[PDB]
mmCIF file of C-alpha atoms in Angstrom:
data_model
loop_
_atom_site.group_PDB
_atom_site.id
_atom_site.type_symbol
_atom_site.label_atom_id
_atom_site.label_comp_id
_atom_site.label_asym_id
_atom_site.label_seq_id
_atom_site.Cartn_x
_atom_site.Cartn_y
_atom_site.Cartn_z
ATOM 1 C CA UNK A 2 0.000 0.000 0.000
ATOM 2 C CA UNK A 3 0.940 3.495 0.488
ATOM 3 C CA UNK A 4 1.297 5.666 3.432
ATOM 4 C CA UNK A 5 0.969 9.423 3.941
ATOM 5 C CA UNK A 6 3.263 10.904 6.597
ATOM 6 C CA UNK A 7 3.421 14.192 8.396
ATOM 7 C CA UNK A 8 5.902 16.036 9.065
ATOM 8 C CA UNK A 9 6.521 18.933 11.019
ATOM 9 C CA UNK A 10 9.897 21.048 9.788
ATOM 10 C CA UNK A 11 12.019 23.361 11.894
ATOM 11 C CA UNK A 12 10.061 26.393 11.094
ATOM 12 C CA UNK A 13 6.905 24.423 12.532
ATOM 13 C CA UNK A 14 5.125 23.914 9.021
ATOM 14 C CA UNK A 15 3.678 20.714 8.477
ATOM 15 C CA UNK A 16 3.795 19.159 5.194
ATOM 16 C CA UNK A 17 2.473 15.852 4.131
ATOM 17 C CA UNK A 18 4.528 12.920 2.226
ATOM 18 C CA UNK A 19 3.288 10.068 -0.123
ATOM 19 C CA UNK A 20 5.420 7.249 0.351
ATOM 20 C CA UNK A 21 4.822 2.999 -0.163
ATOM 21 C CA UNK A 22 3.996 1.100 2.717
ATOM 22 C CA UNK A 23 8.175 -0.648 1.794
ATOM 23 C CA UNK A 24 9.477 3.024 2.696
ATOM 24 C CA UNK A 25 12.517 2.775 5.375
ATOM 25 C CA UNK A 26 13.437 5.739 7.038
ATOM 26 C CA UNK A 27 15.939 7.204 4.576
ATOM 27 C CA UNK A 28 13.542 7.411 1.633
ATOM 28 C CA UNK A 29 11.320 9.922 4.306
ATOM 29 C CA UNK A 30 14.813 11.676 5.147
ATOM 30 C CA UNK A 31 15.487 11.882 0.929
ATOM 31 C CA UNK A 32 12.001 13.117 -0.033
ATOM 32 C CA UNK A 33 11.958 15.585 3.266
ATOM 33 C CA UNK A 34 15.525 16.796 2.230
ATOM 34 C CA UNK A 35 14.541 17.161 -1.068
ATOM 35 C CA UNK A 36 11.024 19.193 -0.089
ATOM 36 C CA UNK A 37 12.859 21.510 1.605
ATOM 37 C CA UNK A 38 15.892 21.568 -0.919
ATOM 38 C CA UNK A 39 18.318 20.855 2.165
ATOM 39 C CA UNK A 40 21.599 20.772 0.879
ATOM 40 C CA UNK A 41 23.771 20.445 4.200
ATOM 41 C CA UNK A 42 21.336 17.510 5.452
ATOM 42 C CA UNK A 43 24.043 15.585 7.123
ATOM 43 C CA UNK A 44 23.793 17.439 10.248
ATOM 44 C CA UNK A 45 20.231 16.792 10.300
ATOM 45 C CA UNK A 46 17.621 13.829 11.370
ATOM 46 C CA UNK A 47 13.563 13.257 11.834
ATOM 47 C CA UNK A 48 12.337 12.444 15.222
ATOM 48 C CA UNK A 49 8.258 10.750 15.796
ATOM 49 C CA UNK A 50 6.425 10.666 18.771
ATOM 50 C CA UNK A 51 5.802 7.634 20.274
ATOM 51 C CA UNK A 52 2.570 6.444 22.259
ATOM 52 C CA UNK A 53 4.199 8.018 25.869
ATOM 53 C CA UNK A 54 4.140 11.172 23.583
ATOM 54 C CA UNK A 55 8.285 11.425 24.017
ATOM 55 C CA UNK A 56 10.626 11.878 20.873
ATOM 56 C CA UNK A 57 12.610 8.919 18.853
ATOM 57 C CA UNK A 58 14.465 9.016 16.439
ATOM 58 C CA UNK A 59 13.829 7.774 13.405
ATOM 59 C CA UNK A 60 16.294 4.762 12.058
ATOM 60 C CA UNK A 61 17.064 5.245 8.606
ATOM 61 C CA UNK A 62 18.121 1.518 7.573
ATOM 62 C CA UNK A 63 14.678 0.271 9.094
ATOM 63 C CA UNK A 64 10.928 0.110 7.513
ATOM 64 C CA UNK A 65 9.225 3.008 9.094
ATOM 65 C CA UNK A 66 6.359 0.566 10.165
ATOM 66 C CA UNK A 67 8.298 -1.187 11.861
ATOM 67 C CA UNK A 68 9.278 1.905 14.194
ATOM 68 C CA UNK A 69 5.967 3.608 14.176
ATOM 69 C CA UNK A 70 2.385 1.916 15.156
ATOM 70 C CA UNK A 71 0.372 4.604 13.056
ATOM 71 C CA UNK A 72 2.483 6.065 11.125
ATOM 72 C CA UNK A 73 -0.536 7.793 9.416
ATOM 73 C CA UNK A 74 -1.124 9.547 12.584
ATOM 74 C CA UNK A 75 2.450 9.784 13.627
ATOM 75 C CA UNK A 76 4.223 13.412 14.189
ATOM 76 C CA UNK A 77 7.529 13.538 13.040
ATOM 77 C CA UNK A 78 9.474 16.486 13.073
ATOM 78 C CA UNK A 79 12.862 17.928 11.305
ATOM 79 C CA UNK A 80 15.530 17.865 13.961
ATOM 80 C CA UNK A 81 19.297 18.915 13.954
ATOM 81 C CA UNK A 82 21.255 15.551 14.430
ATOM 82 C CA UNK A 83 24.934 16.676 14.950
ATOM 83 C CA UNK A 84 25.668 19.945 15.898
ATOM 84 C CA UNK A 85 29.231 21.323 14.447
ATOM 85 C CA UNK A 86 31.814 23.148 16.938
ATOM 86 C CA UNK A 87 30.522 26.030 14.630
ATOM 87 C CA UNK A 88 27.564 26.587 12.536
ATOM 88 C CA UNK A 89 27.422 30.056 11.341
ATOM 89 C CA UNK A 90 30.810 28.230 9.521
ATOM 90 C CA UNK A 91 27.754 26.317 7.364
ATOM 91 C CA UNK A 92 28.135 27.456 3.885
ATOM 92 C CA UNK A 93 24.525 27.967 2.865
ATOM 93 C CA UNK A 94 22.800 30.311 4.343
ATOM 94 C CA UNK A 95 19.423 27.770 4.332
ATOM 95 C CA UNK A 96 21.317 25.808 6.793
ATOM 96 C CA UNK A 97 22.725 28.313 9.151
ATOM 97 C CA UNK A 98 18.375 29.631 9.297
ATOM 98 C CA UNK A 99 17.953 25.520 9.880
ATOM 99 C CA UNK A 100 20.220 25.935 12.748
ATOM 100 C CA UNK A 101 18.850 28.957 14.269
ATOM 101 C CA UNK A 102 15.163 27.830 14.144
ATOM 102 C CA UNK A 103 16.729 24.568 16.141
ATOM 103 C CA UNK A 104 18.131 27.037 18.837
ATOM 104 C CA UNK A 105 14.744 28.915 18.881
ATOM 105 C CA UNK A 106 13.156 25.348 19.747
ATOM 106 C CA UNK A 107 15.267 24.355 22.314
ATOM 107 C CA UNK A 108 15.011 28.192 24.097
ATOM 108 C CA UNK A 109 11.805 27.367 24.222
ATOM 109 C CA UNK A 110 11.419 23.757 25.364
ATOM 110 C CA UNK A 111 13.956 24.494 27.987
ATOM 111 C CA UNK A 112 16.449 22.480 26.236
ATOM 112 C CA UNK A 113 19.225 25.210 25.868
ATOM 113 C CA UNK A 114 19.166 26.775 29.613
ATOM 114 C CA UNK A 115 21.103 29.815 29.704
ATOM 115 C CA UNK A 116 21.081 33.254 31.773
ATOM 116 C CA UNK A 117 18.556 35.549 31.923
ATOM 117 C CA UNK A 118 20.310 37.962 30.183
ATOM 118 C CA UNK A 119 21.918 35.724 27.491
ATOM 119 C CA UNK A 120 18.127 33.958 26.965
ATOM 120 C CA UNK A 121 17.016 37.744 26.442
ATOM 121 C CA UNK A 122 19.482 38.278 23.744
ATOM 122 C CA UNK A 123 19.135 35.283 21.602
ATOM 123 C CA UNK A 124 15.722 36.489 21.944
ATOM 124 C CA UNK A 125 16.042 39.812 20.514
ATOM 125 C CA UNK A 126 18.072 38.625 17.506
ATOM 126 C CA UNK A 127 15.048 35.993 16.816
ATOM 127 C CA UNK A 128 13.040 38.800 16.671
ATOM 128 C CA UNK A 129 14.933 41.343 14.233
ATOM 129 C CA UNK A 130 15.276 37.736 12.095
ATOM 130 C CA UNK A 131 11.226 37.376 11.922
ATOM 131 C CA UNK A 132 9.273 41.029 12.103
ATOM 132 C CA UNK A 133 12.844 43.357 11.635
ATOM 133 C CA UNK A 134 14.070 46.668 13.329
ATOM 134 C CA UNK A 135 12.595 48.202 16.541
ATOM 135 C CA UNK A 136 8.834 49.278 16.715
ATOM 136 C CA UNK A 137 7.415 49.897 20.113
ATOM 137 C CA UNK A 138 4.072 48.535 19.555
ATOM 138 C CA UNK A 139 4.965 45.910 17.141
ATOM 139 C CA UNK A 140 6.993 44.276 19.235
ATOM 140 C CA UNK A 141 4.562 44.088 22.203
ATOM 141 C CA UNK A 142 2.098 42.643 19.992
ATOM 142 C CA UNK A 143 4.998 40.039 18.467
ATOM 143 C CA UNK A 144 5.772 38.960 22.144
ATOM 144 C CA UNK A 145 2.109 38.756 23.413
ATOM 145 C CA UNK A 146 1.129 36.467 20.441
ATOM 146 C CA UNK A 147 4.861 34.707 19.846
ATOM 147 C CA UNK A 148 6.500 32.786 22.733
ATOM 148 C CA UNK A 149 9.984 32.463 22.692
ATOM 149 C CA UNK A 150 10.749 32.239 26.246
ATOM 150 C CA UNK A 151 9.480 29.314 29.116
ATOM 151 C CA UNK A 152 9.040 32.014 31.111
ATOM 152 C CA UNK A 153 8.810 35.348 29.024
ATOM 153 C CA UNK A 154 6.615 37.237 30.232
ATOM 154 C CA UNK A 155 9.408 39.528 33.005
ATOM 155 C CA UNK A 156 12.091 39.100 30.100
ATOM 156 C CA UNK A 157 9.867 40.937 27.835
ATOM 157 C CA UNK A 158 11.113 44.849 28.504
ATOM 158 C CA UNK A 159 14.817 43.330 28.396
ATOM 159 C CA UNK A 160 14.114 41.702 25.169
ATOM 160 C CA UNK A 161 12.996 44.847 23.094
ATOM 161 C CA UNK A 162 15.865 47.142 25.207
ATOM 162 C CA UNK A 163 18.090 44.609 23.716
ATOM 163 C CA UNK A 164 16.174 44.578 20.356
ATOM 164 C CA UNK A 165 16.642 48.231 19.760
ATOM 165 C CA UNK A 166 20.298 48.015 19.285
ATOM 166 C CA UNK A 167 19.590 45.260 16.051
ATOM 167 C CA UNK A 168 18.516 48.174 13.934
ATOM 168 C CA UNK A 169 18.907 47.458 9.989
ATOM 169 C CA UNK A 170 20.210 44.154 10.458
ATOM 170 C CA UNK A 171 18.636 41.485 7.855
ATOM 171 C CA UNK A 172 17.291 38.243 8.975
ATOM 172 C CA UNK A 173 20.496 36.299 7.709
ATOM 173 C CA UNK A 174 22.892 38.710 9.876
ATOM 174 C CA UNK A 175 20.425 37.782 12.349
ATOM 175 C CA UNK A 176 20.819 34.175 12.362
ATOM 176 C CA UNK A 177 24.611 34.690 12.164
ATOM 177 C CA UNK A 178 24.441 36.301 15.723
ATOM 178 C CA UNK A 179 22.333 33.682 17.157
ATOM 179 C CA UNK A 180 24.138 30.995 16.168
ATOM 180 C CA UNK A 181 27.597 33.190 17.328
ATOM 181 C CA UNK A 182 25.816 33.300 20.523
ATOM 182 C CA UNK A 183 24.586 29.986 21.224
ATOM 183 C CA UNK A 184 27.617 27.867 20.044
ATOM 184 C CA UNK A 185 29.156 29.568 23.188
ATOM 185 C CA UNK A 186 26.892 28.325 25.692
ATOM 186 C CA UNK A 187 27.830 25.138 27.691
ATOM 187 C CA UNK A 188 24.017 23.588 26.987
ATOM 188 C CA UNK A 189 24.875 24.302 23.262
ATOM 189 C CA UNK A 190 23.939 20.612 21.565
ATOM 190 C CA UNK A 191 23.218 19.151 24.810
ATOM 191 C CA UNK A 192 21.370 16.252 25.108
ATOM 192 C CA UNK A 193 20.808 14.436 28.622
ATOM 193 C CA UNK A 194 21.218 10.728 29.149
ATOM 194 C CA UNK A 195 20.887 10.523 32.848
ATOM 195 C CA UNK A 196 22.568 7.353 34.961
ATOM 196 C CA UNK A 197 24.729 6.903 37.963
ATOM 197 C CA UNK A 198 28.079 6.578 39.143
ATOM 198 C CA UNK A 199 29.731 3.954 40.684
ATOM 199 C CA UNK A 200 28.775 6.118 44.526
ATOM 200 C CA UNK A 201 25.749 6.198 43.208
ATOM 201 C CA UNK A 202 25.499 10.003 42.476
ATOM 202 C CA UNK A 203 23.138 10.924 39.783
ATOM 203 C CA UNK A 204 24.877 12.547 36.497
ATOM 204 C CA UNK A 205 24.008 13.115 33.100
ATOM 205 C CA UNK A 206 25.513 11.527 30.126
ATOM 206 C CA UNK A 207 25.987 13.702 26.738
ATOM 207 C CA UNK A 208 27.928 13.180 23.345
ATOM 208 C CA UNK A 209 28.944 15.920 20.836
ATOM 209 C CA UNK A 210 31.299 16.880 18.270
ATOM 210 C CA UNK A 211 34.002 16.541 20.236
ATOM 211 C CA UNK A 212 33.660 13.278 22.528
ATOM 212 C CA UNK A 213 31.374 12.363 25.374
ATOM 213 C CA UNK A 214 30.194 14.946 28.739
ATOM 214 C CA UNK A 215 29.529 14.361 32.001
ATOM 215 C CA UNK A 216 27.130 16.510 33.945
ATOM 216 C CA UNK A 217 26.099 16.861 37.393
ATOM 217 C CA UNK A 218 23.100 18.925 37.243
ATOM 218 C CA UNK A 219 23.819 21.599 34.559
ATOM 219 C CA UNK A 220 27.130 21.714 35.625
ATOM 220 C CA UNK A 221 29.654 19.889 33.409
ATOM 221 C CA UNK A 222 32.009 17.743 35.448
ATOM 222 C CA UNK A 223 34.221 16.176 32.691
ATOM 223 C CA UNK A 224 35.334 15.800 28.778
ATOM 224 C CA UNK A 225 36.594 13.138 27.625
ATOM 225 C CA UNK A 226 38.127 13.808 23.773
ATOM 226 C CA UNK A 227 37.641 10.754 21.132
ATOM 227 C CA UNK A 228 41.570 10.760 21.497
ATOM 228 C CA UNK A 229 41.458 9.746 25.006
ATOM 229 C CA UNK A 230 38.717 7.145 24.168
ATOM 230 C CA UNK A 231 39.794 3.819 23.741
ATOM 231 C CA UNK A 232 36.238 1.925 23.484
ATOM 232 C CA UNK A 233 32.503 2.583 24.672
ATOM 233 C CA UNK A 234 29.641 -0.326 25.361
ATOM 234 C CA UNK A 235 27.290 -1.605 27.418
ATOM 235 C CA UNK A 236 26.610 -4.523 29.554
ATOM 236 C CA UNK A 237 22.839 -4.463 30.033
ATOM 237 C CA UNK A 238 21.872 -1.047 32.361
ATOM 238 C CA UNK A 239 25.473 -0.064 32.627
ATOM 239 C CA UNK A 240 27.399 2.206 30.258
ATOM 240 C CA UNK A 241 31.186 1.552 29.909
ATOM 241 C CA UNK A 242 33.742 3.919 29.062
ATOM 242 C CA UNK A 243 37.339 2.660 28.154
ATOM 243 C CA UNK A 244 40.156 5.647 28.493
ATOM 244 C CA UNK A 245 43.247 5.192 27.146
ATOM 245 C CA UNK A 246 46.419 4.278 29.990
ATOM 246 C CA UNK A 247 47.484 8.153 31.339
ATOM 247 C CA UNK A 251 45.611 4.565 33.973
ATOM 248 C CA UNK A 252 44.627 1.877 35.975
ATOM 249 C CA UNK A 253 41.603 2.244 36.582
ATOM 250 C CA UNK A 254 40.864 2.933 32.680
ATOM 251 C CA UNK A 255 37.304 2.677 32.968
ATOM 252 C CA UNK A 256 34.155 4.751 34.228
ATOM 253 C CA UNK A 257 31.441 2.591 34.580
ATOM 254 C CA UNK A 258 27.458 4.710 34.903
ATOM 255 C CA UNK A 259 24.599 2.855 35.303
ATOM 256 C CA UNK A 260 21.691 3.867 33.267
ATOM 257 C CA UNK A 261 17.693 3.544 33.698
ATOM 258 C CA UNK A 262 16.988 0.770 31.423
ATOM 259 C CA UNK A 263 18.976 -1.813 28.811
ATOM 260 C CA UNK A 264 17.429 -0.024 25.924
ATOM 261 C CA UNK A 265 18.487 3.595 27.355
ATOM 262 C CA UNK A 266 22.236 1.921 27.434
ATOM 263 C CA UNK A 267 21.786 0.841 23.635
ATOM 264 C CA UNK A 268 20.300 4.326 22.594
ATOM 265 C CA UNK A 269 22.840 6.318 24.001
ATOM 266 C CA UNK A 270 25.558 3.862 22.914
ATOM 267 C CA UNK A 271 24.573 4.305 19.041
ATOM 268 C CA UNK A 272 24.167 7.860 19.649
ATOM 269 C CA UNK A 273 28.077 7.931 20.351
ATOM 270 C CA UNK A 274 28.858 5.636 17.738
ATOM 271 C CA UNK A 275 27.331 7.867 15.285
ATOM 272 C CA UNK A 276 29.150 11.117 17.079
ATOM 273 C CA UNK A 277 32.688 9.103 16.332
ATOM 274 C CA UNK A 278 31.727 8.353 13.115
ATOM 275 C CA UNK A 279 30.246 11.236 12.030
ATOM 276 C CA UNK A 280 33.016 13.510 13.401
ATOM 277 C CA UNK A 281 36.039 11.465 13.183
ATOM 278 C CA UNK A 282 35.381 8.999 10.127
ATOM 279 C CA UNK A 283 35.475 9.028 6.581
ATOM 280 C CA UNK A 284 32.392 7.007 6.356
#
């Protein structure tokens, strides 16, 4: 048969695609990509809700009903895979927008936790990028009817202060700045994989561009570089990390919530090393 999916792309517009009931995930990637005319689509991924309403991501190599139980009713959504150390270094401008409609997301889903201040000025520059240069009462009426914020409301007055100095740049500058901005925050790309250490103090587990994080709370304990790395994998709930000698102890063991969270968050760094560090 054939199947019509929806999804949702980073700029929140839903479009629909035709596709055969054979379909794995990489012909949905392919025709999305193509929809969009995404050039730079390495960086990028879909994500579908499942029944507990949380976000998977979608394997490519698999049939897509064989990940999804109605996939006709199914919300997937456009979502940035792999962030680079830099993005406004993207070449096409297309991509570096991609980017900074993924940063608006994650301001606003609480992903990307930042200061006050620095939440306020991302938020200003997402502004000049949609509705342009300073306008007292276009701007209140923006912010009453756009959220941008978790909580935006007291932020508001600080956002269009901060807005007013954005004057004449184009929406293109504008995603430059927020992408200059962002890439310097420590929650940059962060996802959370929370487990335990060996005392049994609760962490979170992260992987990006660079090698794996450890956080305790939103504080980043520790780096370890894919040079220091001498294997990663799993032995049911726990999560093994093998360092290189300088060095006796060469391993940090964290035990996760479930077997499956191990597995997730293992292919999720196998894909960081090979996306980063291999030539396919």
């Amino acid at each position: 048969k054939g199947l019509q999916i929806r999804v949702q792309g980073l700029d929140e517009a839903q479009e629909f695609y035709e596709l055969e009931s054979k379909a794995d995930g990489q012909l949905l990637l392919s025709d999305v990509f193509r929809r969009i005319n995404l050039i730079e689509s390495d960086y990028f991924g879909l994500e579908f809700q499942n029944l507990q309403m949380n976000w998977v991501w979608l394997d490519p190599s698999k049939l897509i009903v064989k990940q999804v139980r109605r996939p006709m009713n199914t919300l997937f959504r456009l979502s940035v895979k792999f962030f680079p150390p830099d993005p406004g270094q993207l070449q096409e401008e297309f991509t570096r927008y991609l980017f900074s409609l993924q940063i608006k997301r994650d301001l606003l889903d609480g992903r990307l936790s930042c200061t006050e201040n620095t939440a306020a000025l991302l938020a200003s520059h997402l502004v000049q990028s949609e509705i342009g240069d300073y306008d007292d009462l276009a701007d209140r009426e923006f912010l009453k009817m756009n959220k941008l914020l978790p909580c935006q409301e007291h932020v508001q007055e600080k956002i269009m202060e901060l807005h007013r100095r954005h004057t004449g740049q184009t929406p293109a500058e504008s995603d430059f700045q927020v992408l200059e901005i962002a890439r310097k925050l420590e929650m940059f790309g962060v996802r959370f994989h929370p487990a335990a250490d060996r005392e049994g103090t609760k962490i979170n587990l992260a992987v990006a561009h660079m090698g794996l994080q450890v956080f305790q709370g939103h504080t980043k304990i520790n780096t370890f570089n894919w040079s220091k790395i001498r294997k990663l994998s799993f032995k049911r709930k726990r999560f093994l990390i093998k360092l290189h000698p300088e060095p006796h102890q060469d391993t940090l063991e964290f035990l996760m919530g479930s077997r499956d969270q191990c597995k997730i968050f293992w292919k999720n760094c196998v894909e960081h090393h090979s996306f980063f560090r291999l030539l396919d």
